[PDB]
Each structure stands twice: as structure tokens, then as C-alpha cells.
């Protein structure tokens, strides 16, 4: 499957149980189509490249 | 699109219906200039072209000629996923 990854899990008890602490780097890797669309939507990046 | 899968035995006439040409020889490729060696198991004539929209003899190399079987080596210039 695309859009998927895995890494070690750990505790994080500050969480409310509708959320999971998910790392910045995996999240920026998994959400690149969304980020590209958002950047060229807000105009911070002229083309997709 | 569709709504059911039928399964039955394949006849000689059906098996010649799916197919695009007999595979006569066992050659796969040309070991020096790795072309699909006609007309063996990877035959550009039979199973399609090797790169999109390019004949095998190099004569036709553009989408201007989509669909034209070459004269020289007879490879229908079409998308190479027809190879599949």
C-alpha cells in the first residue's frame, strides 16, 4: 500500500484517546501530495516542482 | 461496468481468438542488441512494441503515427502496456 509507514511505538500519556503522536518526518513524508497542493494553492510555490 | 465472472473451457477457436499471432521459435532476445527477436516468445510483432509509440525498426517514432503497423518489421506503434 502507498501512503503508509511504520516505526517504533512508545507511550505518550498526555494524549487524549482520540489522538496518536505521529512524528513530523513520517507525517511530512506521508502527506506530500497534500502539502504540494496546499503550497501551490496558497501560492508559496509557483509550480509543483 | 460488469457484474459477473463466467468460467468455461477454452476452445481452439477461442484460443486463436484471444491471440495475436503464433509464437514459432524459442528465441527471447538478441544478446548483443537486446531486441525482442521475432518471432519468438517476446515478439514485438506479436505482443506489441517495446517503448511507447515507437516501432522496432525505428522508422516510426512519434504519436503522429498512432496505430500504424510498420511495413518493414510490422510492429503496431501503440502504448507499450499493450505488451502486457
Amino acid at each position: 500500500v502507498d501512503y503508509s509507514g511504520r516505526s517504533v511505538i512508545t507511550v505518550g500519556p498526555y494524549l487524549r484517546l482520540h489522538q496518536c503522536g505521529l512524528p513530523k518526518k513520517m507525517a511530512l513524508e506521508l502527506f506530500k501530495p497534500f502539502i504540494y497542493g496546499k503550497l501551490e494553492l496558497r501560492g508559496l510555490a509557483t509550480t509543483i516542482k | 461496468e460488469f457484474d459477473a465472472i463466467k468460467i468455461a473451457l477454452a476452445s481452439p477457436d477461442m484460443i486463436r481468438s484471444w491471440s495475436f499471432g503464433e509464437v514459432k521459435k524459442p528465441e527471447t532476445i538478441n544478446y548483443r542488441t537486446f531486441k525482442p527477436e521475432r518471432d519468438g516468445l517476446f515478439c514485438a510483432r506479436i505482443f506489441g512494441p517495446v517503448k511507447d509509440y515507437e516501432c522496432l525498426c525505428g522508422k516510426y517514432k512519434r504519436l503522429k503515427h498512432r496505430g500504424v503497423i510498420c511495413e518493414k518489421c510490422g510492429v503496431e506503434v501503440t502504448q507499450t502496456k499493450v505488451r502486457r
Binding site: - | 509464437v23 514459432k24 521459435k25 524459442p26 527471447t28 537486446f34 517476446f42 502486457r84
Partner: protein, 49 residues
């Protein structure tokens, strides 16, 4: 392209196994056509079939 002879990097080819099985079937097929062209003895065409 469902039984490919893709060249893995290094000049080495990486064929499938169906290329072997078809190559063998077609060799024995062509040989049987020949053994019927030479009007061969019976035991040889029986062995070939």
C-alpha cells in the same frame, strides 16, 4: 510483461520461469514437427509426443 526478462542492474538478466517452460514446450514442439517431416521411425515420434 507478465513473465518478464527484465535486466537487473549489472548486465545480468533476471528472467521468469515461464520463459523456461514455454521455451521447452516450443522446442519439443518444433522438434516433433521435424520428426514428422523426416518421416521418422515410429518409436522416435512416439518418444517425441
Amino acid at each position: 510483461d507478465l513473465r518478464p526478462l527484465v535486466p537487473l542492474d549489472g548486465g545480468r538478466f533476471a528472467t521468469s520461469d515461464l520463459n523456461d517452460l514455454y521455451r521447452r514446450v516450443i522446442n519439443r514442439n518444433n522438434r516433433l514437427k521435424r520428426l514428422l517431416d523426416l518421416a521418422a521411425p515410429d518409436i522416435i515420434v512416439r518418444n517425441e509426443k
